[PDB]
Structures are given as structure tokens and as C-alpha cells.
Amino acid sequence: MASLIYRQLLTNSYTVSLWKEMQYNRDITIRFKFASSIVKSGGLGYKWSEISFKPANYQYTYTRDGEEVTAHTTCSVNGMNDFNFNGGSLPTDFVISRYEVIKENSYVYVDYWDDSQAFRNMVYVRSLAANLNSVICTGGDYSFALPVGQWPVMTGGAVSLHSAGVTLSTQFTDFVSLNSLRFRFRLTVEEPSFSITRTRVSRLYGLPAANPNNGKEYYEVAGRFSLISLVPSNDDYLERQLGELREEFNALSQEIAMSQLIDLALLPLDMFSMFSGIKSTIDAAKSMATSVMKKFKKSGLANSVSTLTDCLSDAASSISRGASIRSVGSSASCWTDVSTSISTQTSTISRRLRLKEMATQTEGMNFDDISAAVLKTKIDRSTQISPNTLPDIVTEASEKFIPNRAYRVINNDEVFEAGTDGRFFAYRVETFDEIPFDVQKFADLVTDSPVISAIIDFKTLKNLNDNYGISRQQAFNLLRSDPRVLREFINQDNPIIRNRIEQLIMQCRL
Amino acid sequence: ASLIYRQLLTNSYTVSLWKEMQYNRDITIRFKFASSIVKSGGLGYKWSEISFKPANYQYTYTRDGEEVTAHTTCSVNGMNDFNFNGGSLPTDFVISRYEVIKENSYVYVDYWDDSQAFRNMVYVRSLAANLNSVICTGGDYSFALPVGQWPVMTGGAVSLHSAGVTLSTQFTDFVSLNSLRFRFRLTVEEPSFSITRTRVSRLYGLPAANPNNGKEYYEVAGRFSLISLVPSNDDYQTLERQLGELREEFNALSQEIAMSQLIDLALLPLDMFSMFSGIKSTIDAAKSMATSVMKKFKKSGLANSVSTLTDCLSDAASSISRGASIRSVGSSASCWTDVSTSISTQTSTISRRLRLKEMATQTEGMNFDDISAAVLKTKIDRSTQISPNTLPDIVTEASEKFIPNRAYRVINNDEVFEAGTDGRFFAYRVETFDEIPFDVQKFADLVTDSPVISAIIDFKTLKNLNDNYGISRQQAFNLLRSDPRVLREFINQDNPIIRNRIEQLIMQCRL
Amino acid sequence: MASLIYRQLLTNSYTVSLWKEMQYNRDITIRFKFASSIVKSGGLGYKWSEISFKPANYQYTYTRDGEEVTAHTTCSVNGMNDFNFNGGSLPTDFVISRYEVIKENSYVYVDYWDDSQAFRNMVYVRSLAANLNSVICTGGDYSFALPVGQWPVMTGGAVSLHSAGVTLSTQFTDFVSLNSLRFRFRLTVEEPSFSITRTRVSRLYGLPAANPNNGKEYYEVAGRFSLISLVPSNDDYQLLGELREEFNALSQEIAMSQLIDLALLPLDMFSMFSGIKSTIDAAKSMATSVMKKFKKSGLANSVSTLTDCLSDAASSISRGASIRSVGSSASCWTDVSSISTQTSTISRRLRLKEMATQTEGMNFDDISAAVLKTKIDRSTQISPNTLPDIVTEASEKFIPNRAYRVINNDEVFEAGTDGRFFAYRVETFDEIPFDVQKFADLVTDSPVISAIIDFKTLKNLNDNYGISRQQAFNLLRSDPRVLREFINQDNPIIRNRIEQLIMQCRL
């Protein structure tokens, strides 16, 4: 459990979240404006080349419900009809070679954009739809300034714009390029017609392309849109000296309670519990489990685990082991090997039981459990545990917490111990009395059978059985490293155990 | 079946969308050049420039049974600027500058279609195409001079060979297209271009006056294979009354649920996949349901209480203020024996913390939340109104409001101590069930460390059964330990004192 | 454990990453240039209609710290003031209707772009910052080409460019479109003023809009930028016929003692994909690649279908699916010589009991996964597109026939997918009629065990290599300790069975 957090870091290292589907629902005030292109031919001044529409950019600033919002609109037309009027071939007759008009068969496009969060990084959009209201575009009065004679005026023209389909588009300009929202509008001819006064043309529906605004600042229409777009999870599109952080640990040296520590080290403190409560203040939250894992699977522990896996696989499959490497006792196995007297051999064989402890081949208190409990106590009670600094501190912890530990194995009422400090014992279960430590049997048992972690190691167990005379059940449970009886003793206030626990603390400090 | 709860809590850190798709498609690029003439003033013998322009062409051509709308845009770069002046007079034929295509120059062609490969193509890798080489021959452009003979530029042939491919963007006044950029190199051929009635001929290249030769387009076939990045949901181009209805559906299917098969299902490690693959129809290409449910799951009473238990063991182990403050019954306070709010009160307050022993792996028996999850799975699989959009926060409301009033027990040397959130507490013996005074300050020290077991077989029904349907020692031990073997044995032997308890639990998981 | 890896694959199926937040910090040499637009009115040539600025593109190639980098810089100005100077209403007096001048109120924009990686796919950016140094920009000598008269020369003018905020922009052209970075610069007038000679204008500050480059090839200013952008993790965005034979060549070369030592380890995803000397792309996407095919197979579909049938057997009861049930009642764990047929059919779901964590012994799929991890670290032919569906063909075709047992009151009931059943007592091996309709009621709920030590070899062993009570109980329970102890005692009646298991783990 408390070592299952390490096993989980390992397992989920492959993951070493970023996007989010955000829904947006906001009201808008589309204020657009037509624009006309007027090219007058030379000569006397009686001949006009074209009278057409021009896409017109228009940036404005209106008031939302307690916010001031800048916006930017661009109106355009498609499918307009090209009419013309030629009354004579002489330089003194009024002629307009080709002018554009809008009718049913045409459509009116309006690109819209704001500075809001919806259009900040909008490149992908689905579930798009909008409810727009209909308006009325009325043309104005443009006086064709002829040199001499009369002055025809194109006056009138009304047309109702009704909502239509919506899409995306891009407003291109010489400064900014904007991924914008394209509203379509259909046209219904109204009663006011446009007619050129003092001319033989009148009673023709449409809108004139000389003064469509009719001296207005804009044409206003309000709307609402609802869509779902893609945006990065992070809505935005010195820390310490490690010596001094070690001194912060030395300030949190020793004062973990023992009942509380043993109760804390019996909880599956999974990723959520382990990275939620720690220091209760961070904005980013950008997968800090991944941020610590990317440094966790770069260290000696992880490389040694992978080396164990590869020596097992290779040597099993076909590979011979170098003359320095030797098989002690039974058939070859990384678990049973003298890397390279008996003290040395047993320490070397114990250096892999640390990996057994974090390969789910344990039976008891699983020392890495207590190491992780201490870690979760320290990074909780502390404050300089910044997400940049927790990576490689979890690894310094996992690699420098409780280096000198000890293990044991049980076989038919006969226990065989071992430790990385070069110590090796063999002792009976019922009546503790040492035995000649049996090599070629300790290896054969520890290779396969479940191993136990010697928090109650044979020295302390002897001292305890001697002074605090022990019952059979208590002895069996201490051998099996049972937290129930361990905490019953810690509440019985047994100094022979409190000393061992304070020594574990002084060894798990750093 | 609480493995779903455990894995949700564990993988809540992850809180998929995009997808790598391969597209291998044929194309018929029907492209076209366009020339830009500018004729100087004076008489009409003087030409300012004769150059190229980016030339767009949109059309609609037939695929193998599909009508595909397409869009091409051709252009040339690195062309050579030749000139030719017959003199300095207003009447002499002069072309101050004209562009010609040679080997050193390159031809660019942007291509786009209305198929699926191009709708949201913004990132691409493994890009490659198999294009064939073509030939391009010059046209016949008759320079209109005011008076006299009529020179005509005629000839020129250059072969276009396929080359590297990349991306580009075809801008217009109406649309903007994320397009594919085919590049082409040039190699001279035998037909050379020359102006009739003029002292120039037998020089290689392709003129820029009229490349199309009057052809409506030049056509070249190809195929392209690539790998692009796109959103999963292909839709990026082109609750009180409902929850009450679902409550009613649960409170009408609860009794239609069975007991034997439910106990059979409650021994299954139903992982995320096992729970979210067997949806009724996998309705339409749903999102990551684990993330969808978790982003609601980790805001609730359950998860916040887990975090509180965590932090109250943490601070308590860090400094002695919290342990000393929680005011336990006595003889330890790690965090668990805390009374926020007599015996009844303490026991209920402690059992509301024992609610986490189930999803803390501190159990040994039937693990009641397993039954809750199983009933949830059964109902959301046999229901019709359950949507993937409303299942988030329903997987949380169920976990939070299933079996609010529940009971737990602890065994210690042939002495069994029960307790419940409803404020009940019974102490008794294992073999000969006989009530006994309940021992506070011992029940707490035992439930802290010793494994805790669920009260599906609680003392009341246990004693009714021991009287009517009197039981043997091994079966009684296994009922205490809540074994599925003996439980299913009784459920197949049709014991109504267990069937009624199970139906009660069902009426409590009704929601 | 070695089956827990399959259960974990199934669990993490929801993850079936691609993007990443990368930090780029690179040095750059901003070599920009101004450009002016001199428009001359008609008449004689003394009257100037306008002298404005123009967006000035410049494309070049410069040397970074061991790199040769191609770059592109676009200079522009904004908020420049418009001054005028008229010497008379005649066509023969030197007049400039409008000329643009620079002061504090104005700003200078510079769009910058390179061919490096930082600019290849820059579409999203955050935490943008930059360190730029200030420079001085001065105007040259633009001689107004008067047909006749004096020669006015606009000369002088200097301005100090101080850094300002940075943003994004897009440089558009008739050839290329570049997602570029917009460096903005504020201006402070310097001591040298701009003045037109042989003309009544002097001792006025700013930068002349006529010749701001001063005849230079560029204005060089160094800089550095830092950002955090989104990028595809795959850093490139901008053919079984012989595999089976390799497996069957590697099958028996593998040993047995060390294989059993390795088949007890929870070789989770890290441990399973660490010893693979993968490619730069496989190490990034291996797990999801194999998972997207692992949840497409008969194994996954059968698991999901058992789950669907358990849900439907708990719900349907009022209309309960009455297909068949031998035993107490419908379970969907027992859904069906007739006896041999039923047993094989039940064993095709005891494989799911195996990969559902409801076993006690060596859990044959675990041995299969151990063989897999021992073969795919040796096989030379392993590749990113290749391991996916090899993991699945392995999981599907390793040990097709496999047997199981259930113990009840010292009476073992066996079963096998090969249509064989054996009932027998633990202490005294002697067969018994196989009790169907009880074997099912027991295998349904009681734990099951695997047939690594199956009855045939078990009896051969109890005959030849006389066996003790505890050793026999542990061999029934399928204990790896006693298993490895026999394998080290060199018992051919177990070595042969293990070799058979290998040869079935063949692919």
C-alpha cells in the first residue's frame, strides 16, 4: 500500500489532461457596416466605371453586463446581380457601366470577432448554433455630382436581413489575422424601392450600392451563440538550495509519533491522496504525479529494477554469467548470486531484498511503506515542497531512506535472517536460540518463499523475549511483522521497541 | 466490485481527445497558369512587364463513384527576367521585362479538396506522394500593335518532373484552405520559344505570355499518403426531472434485480474497461468515460472525506495537536477514534469513518461497496435513459447515497463487536450467539488495526437464523467472515431470513 | 501478477500522450531593415505628395552557435505623426504636403521568424518572455531630386530603441505564410536631430521617413526568448509468417528453473518495456499502441461478454434467460461425452477465472506472459508497429489447452478444455466417478487452481518418486516453492510437463 505508491509510480511511468472541451454561451451585439467602391471615369464626368460593394472592417467597443468588450466585424456579399444603365454613346449622357444590387438570390456574410475567451485560441469548434434576430437595411441618398445639368440621386431601397446558417472563417487584415465566426444572412425584399431620380428607371427592388448605411454609424443586430471548442487545460494561452532543504528536513528531524506513524503506514495513499493534501496551494496542477515520475524513473532504483528484469530474462533465456558473477547453492538466479566472506555474501544477497520489498514479494511491514509514510508526513507538515522541488526529492528519499535494513525468511519453525550490514543469523521460532546459519538453504528459501522485513530484528527480538516475556501468539505475530501487535506494544510503551523506532526515525531522516 | 472506486481514486491524477489517422487517396490536379501583362503608354510598341501571377482554379471532378469538389492554385518562382528592346524610339518594339521558366526555377502548386482528409488538416507527418511528370507548352500571344506587322510569341516546351511535397495555405477573399504544396522542377526540351518577325529564336525555356496554350487546364494524376492529427469526435466541420425519472427507474428495477447472480457478480474485479465496455449500445463514439466521471468524482463528500482522513493522520503524525484534540475514548488517538457529533453517538460517528475502511483495503469480507457497485452496474446496464453525459455525477451520487445506514463488525478472540451508523451496537460470542455488554475503549483499539467486516449478516438476522435454521460451527465462522461460498449456498437453499435481509439491502440501495 | 499486467492493460484501456508542453530557449540575431515609400506629385518636381513608411521584409541566413540558420524579419511602424512644410503655393517652390516623423507616442513592430524547431509548429504559446538589448537607429541622406535649383538633403535624425512587450503574429506574403513572433519596441528621441539642408527646417527630433537605414545592409540587434508551447510529442509533424518461426526457434532454448523464478514477478508496464531497447518513437508510444489492439481480441471480447451476461443474468430474472444451467441455478459461470463437452465449455470460462484474479496457483497466463517477456527481449525482430498484435497473438495462442481443479473435503475434481475430467482423493490417489452438478456448484463460487501439476504426472510422480503429505498438498495448491524444489531435485516427470508447457507457449 504505502509501497504500492512506489509500485504505482513505476507502473504509471508509461504515462510520462492537456486539452479540454470547453462550452461557451455568451451574448453579442453585431454592429456591421457596408462600404461602396465608386470609380469615376475621366473625360467630362458623366461616365462611372463601377459602383460595387467592398468588404469593410469595423472595430468598436460596447458594454456587456458589467464589462467593456471590444469587437470587430466585417460584412460582405455573395451572389449579387450586376445591372447597368446606358442612355447614350456621347460624353454628355449619364452612364454607369456596371453596378451591383442585392436580391433573394444573394447572401450576406458577416465575420465577427471579440477579445473574449471564446475567440482567444479558437481553431476547432463543433456543436455550433446561434439564435439571431432579423433587421432592416435601408439605403440612403447619393448625389451623383455631374459637371453641369441635373443631379440624379439614387434614393430608396429597403431589404430585411434574416438569420441563416453559421460557420467559421478567417478575417485577414494588414495587422491581425482572426479566426472568426461567419454568420450568414438571407434577404427578403421590402416595400421601399430604390430609384434614380431624374432618370428613366424606378420601381425595382433591392438595395443600392452607393449609400447603404443611410448616414448611420453601423447596422446593429444582437445574437447568442453556443458551441464546444478545444483549448489547452492550462488557461494561459527560484525555489531553494537542496542543502537548505535537507536542513529543513533536519528541522523536521525526529518528532513523528510512533502510534500515529504505524497507523499512517497502513493506508493505500494513492496518487489522489498523496498529491491533493500536500501544502493545499497550487494553481498549475499540471500532472505533478507525472512531474515526479519523470525524475523517479531516471535514478539508481529504477535502473536497478530494470537491470534485475534484464538479468533475469537474459540469463534465463540463453545468457552465460561472467566469471566474476557466481551461483551460490542452487541453480542460477539473480536473486541468488554473489556479485563480489560469508558476511560479504549475505550483505550482497540482502542488497536485492530491497527490490523484493518493492516487487510485491513481501509478507510484512515492507519498510518502503514506513519510508513513504515519513515522506508524506514531511512534505505535508513542510511548506517548501514546490512542484519544481518535489521531483528528485521523492527520489533522494526513496534512495537514502533506511539504507541499512534487514530481512528474514521462515521455513518449518526455523527462521533465517540477513542484513546489508553484513550480519546473518538463524534462530528457532518458539524458543529463540540461534543456529549455525545455513547457506545453500537460506538462499533456496529467500529466492522463492515470501520474505519479511526485520523491524523486530533478532537482536531486538531476543532482548524483548528475554525481558518482556512473550506469548506464542505475540511471538508469531512479531515474526510475521504484524501491525496489530506492533501497535499494541507501542501503546504498552515498550522501551525496547520505542528505541528501535526512534532509530528507524534517525535512519529515515535523510 | 469496489475496484472501480479504488481505481477512480487512484487515477484521479490523470484529470484521449485527438487521434492519429492515416489517409491514402488519389487526386487529379487540374491546374492552370495565368499571365499578368502591363503595356506601357505612348504608341503601343512598348510593353512594361509580362510576368506570372498566382492562378486559382476551383472545380468539381469525378472520383470512382464520388463527386469531389477541388481547388488548385499554381505559381512559379525563381524565373529569369529577360528583356528585349529594338531601340529607344516610341515606334520600336520593346518588352522592358518578361519572365521565362528554366531549370533553376521552381513551380509550386497548392491543392485542396472537400473530402475528409482536408477538412481539419493542420498537422501532418510521413508525408509523401507519387506524382507523374508532365509537359507544358507555350501558347500563341499576338501582340496587338497599332499599325504594321503583328509579332506573335510562339513555342517553348518544358517538362515538369515531380519533386518534394509540403503544406501551404490558399488564401482568398472568401475562404481560407489548409492545403498541400506540391513542388516541381523543370527540364528543358527540344521545342524552343521564339517571337515571329523578330531577331530571337532557338533559346530554351517556357514563355510567360500564354502557357495554357488555350487549354482550359493542365491535368496531372497523383496519389498521396500521410498521417495527420485530428479530434476524435468527427463533428468539427460541415436535470432535476430526468434525474427523478432515473430515480424512479432505479426504484422499479431494484426489485427486478436478482440475488444469486448479484452475489456472483460481486466477486468480480470489474475494472474500468469491464464497467464501461458493456454499455447498452456504446451509444455514439463516447468520450473517455473514466475521465468524465472522475472530474465530478473528485469534488464530493467521499473524496473530500478521504482527503480529510489523510490530512488528519498526517498532521497528527507530524505534531501533537490533532491527536490530542480529537478527544478519543482513550488508550489511543491516531486519527480514527474522533467524535465530532452517548455510546450510540460515538459508535455512529466512528462508523461514518469506517465507511472508508471498505475503500481503503482494510477489509476481509463481502466489502459492501462491492454490492453497491454491482447494483449500480446492473441498473445502468438494464436502463434506457442512462446517457454518457448524465452518467458523470451519477456514478458519484450512487457511491455517496447507497446504503447510508450501514454496520460493521470486528472479531477478537471469540468476541464479536458490532456497530452501526444508525447508532446500534451489539457484542456477542462466535459459536453460541449471546449478547454481552459492549466494550468501548476496546472496540476502538480493535477496529483501528484489526480487519473490519461488513454487517450483511448482522446479529439480528444471524440470531434469527441460528434459532430457526440452526447452523454448524464452520458455516457460522464463514458467515461471520462473510464468505461468498456459504452465502451462495444459503441463497440457493432459499433461506428467507437471508433473502429478506438481501431484499432490505436492495430497498436501501433503491436510491 | 504476470496476469495482473493484462488486468492493468484492461484497466488503463481508457487511456487509449500525444501532445506535450515543451520549453524552448534559443538565442537569435534580429537583423531587420526599414523601408520608405517616396511618392512624388506631378507638375515640375518641387511638390511631394507623401513620404511614408512601408512594411519592410528582409530574408537572410546567419550563423548561430554552430548552426547556420535561415531567418526572415518584417519591420513596421505605428502611430507615427504627420508633419508638413509648404514654401509657397507655386509649382516652383519646394513643398512636402506630408512627411511622417517618429516620436515617443509611436511604436515599432518587428515580426521575426526562423527555420528552427521553435518556429516550425508554433501555434500555441504561454509564459512568453524575452531579453532584448537597446540599439540606436539613425537616418541617412536622402537627396530630393529637383530637376533644377538647389539640392535639399534630408539628413540627421537618431532614435534609441528600447525593448517592450512581445506577442504573436502572422507574416503573410504572396509565397509563404509564417507564424511569427511580434517583437515590439518603444522609442526615445536621441541628441542628433533630423534636418533638411538648404531649407528652413532644423533642430527638430525624430527619425526621417526618407532613408532610415542609413545605407546599411541591416540593423543588427541580438535577443533571447523563452516560452511554453504545445507540440506533437512525435517530433515529425509539420510487410507473422516469420515471427512465429522466430518464436518456435526461441521456444526451447529458454530454460525452466530461471523461467519459473521469473514467472512470479509483477512485471508491470515499466518492467515489461524497460529491457526493450526501443526506438525514440516506440519508447514514447509502445503501451498505448499495444493496448489499442489488445482491446480488440477474442480475449477482451469474451471478458466483456461474460460481464454483459452476468449483468443480464442479474437483471433478466423476471424474464430470466433459460438457455441452460446445470447446478443450483443460472450463474453464467456454468453455461452450456456430454460431461466432457460441458467441462470443456466451463473451462473456456475458467480461463477467465484465471484472468479475473479468482485463482490460487501459477495462473497459466502468468507463465505465458513470462515466456512473452523472455522472448521479446531476445528476438531481434521487434518493432513499434510489430509488437502490437504480437502481444495479442501471444495471449491468445499460448497454452490453448489447459486444465483446472477444485478441492472440496479432500476430494479434487479436475477438468480440461481437452474434454478430460478426473476425480480423485488427495492422500490416496485413486480415481472416482466425476460428480457433475457438484463440480459446477463448487467451481462457480469456491476458488479454482491450475493444472501445472496435472493428475497424470501427479500420479506418475506419486508412484515413482514417493511423495510426502505436505509436499503433495503444496503441489495440489501449486506452490512455487515446492515446484522449484522439485525442479532443482531434477524430477523428469515434472521437467517433461514444463517442457510441454514451453512447447505449447510456441505462437
Ligand SMILES: *[C@@H]1O[C@H](CO)[C@@H](O)[C@H](O)[C@H]1NC(C)=O
Ligand atoms: C540450438 O540451441 C542450443 C541451446 O538451446 C544451442 O546450444 C545451439 O547452439 C543452438 N543451435 C545453433 C545451430 O545455434
